[PDB]
């Protein structure tokens, strides 16, 4: 495990015979505890979720490291921004469907991802993406569909207000992911940029007022109408009115098909 460089807690690129011939891996370390993260990712087997490879130990064997596949093509956000000129609406719908299906898998395991955003979706290749960054992921109790704890423009209003997270706070987030995809993560119309135009006062305060009045992110000018409608659903004021990942999935698959 020879350190190379910083990819993102902290994630580091490492090369795993001594002859510098070993494969590259991504390695997460801290500097609480990601014992939970390791257990969650190890159980998950999906073509749309980054692949666990094992564990190793840190200095003195006092520390665990999480060993995962490294995707050099990097995060979807950067991929979109560089190559916007040559990625079509069909390819974005493909990405959307893949992400949706990984979220379904998570939901069936009572897993709240919480961090879902284009920056922690990885490009395995041009036509295949995988969900990563399980650092804030938390499993729901068997008897309860949310939790409470002690990046504002991705979070549902009840998360911002009352510190509630659920699978439906994830759905609000996935809506914001669709928005990232169909704006190719352009800085000029980022969630944060749109926010600053929507008031010409603390951000979080003003954001919660805007959301309460029903103001949402505008359709990307090049976005298919049916994808915009999905986004607005995902940003339903009440958690219970947002569609499930299971209800979204067919729509995006229907859209991608066409
Ligand atoms: O040098 S960069 O341009 F920043 C650069 C370049 C190429 C790849 C990455 C990268 C970033 N992360 C994580 C994912 C989200 C949160 C932390 C950062 C990766 C990457 C590659 N494989 C990975 N396997 C598991 C996670 C992971 C980063
Ligand atoms: N979900 C959503 O539309 N959020 C939002 C609204 C205005 C500005 C920034 C973010």
Numbering used by the authors: 1 to 8, 13 to 20, 23 to 37, 45 to 163, 169 to 218, 221 to 278
Sentences reproduced from the published study:
JAK3, a member of the Janus kinase family, is pivotal in the signaling pathways of common gamma chain (γc) cytokine receptors. We therefore hypothesized that replacing the cyano group by a fluorosulfate (or sulfonyl fluoride) warhead along with a conformational flip of the phenyl moiety could lead to the first tyrosine-targeting covalent inhibitor of JAK3. Only molecule 25a bearing the sulfonylfluoride warhead in meta position showed an IC50 of 26 nM, close to the inhibitory activity of our non-covalent design starting point (IC50 = 5.2 nM). To validate potential covalent interactions, we performed intact protein mass spectrometry (MS) experiments (3-fold excess compound over JAK3, 4 °C due to stability issues of the JAK3 enzyme, 24 h) to verify whether any of our compounds actually form a covalent bond with the target. Unfortunately, no mass shift as a result of covalent bond formation was observed, indicating that none of the molecules bound covalently to JAK3. We hypothesized that while inhibitor 25a shows nanomolar inhibitory activity, it likely orients itself in the same way as our non-covalent design template 6 where the nitrile points away from the target tyrosine, and therefore the warhead is solvent-exposed rather than pointing towards the hinge region where the target tyrosine is located. We validated this hypothesis by solving the X-ray crystal structure of 25a in complex with JAK3. This crystal structure explains why there is no covalent bond formation – 25a indeed orients itself in exactly the same way that starting point 6 does. While we provide new structural insights into JAK3 inhibitor binding, the JAK3 inhibitors we designed did not achieve covalent binding to the hinge tyrosine side chain.
We aimed to develop covalent inhibitors targeting tyrosine residues in the protein kinases JAK3 and MK2 using structure-based design principles to generate small sets of ligands containing tyrosine-reactive sulfonyl fluoride and the less-explored fluorosulfate warheads. By utilizing a structure-based approach with well-characterized kinases, we focus on Janus kinase 3 (JAK3) and mitogen-activated protein kinase-activated protein kinase 2 (MK2, also known as MAPKAPK2) as model targets. In conclusion, we successfully synthesized a small but diverse set of novel fluorosulfate and sulfonyl fluoride warhead-bearing compounds, initially designed to covalently target tyrosine residues in both JAK3 and MK2 using structure-based design principles.
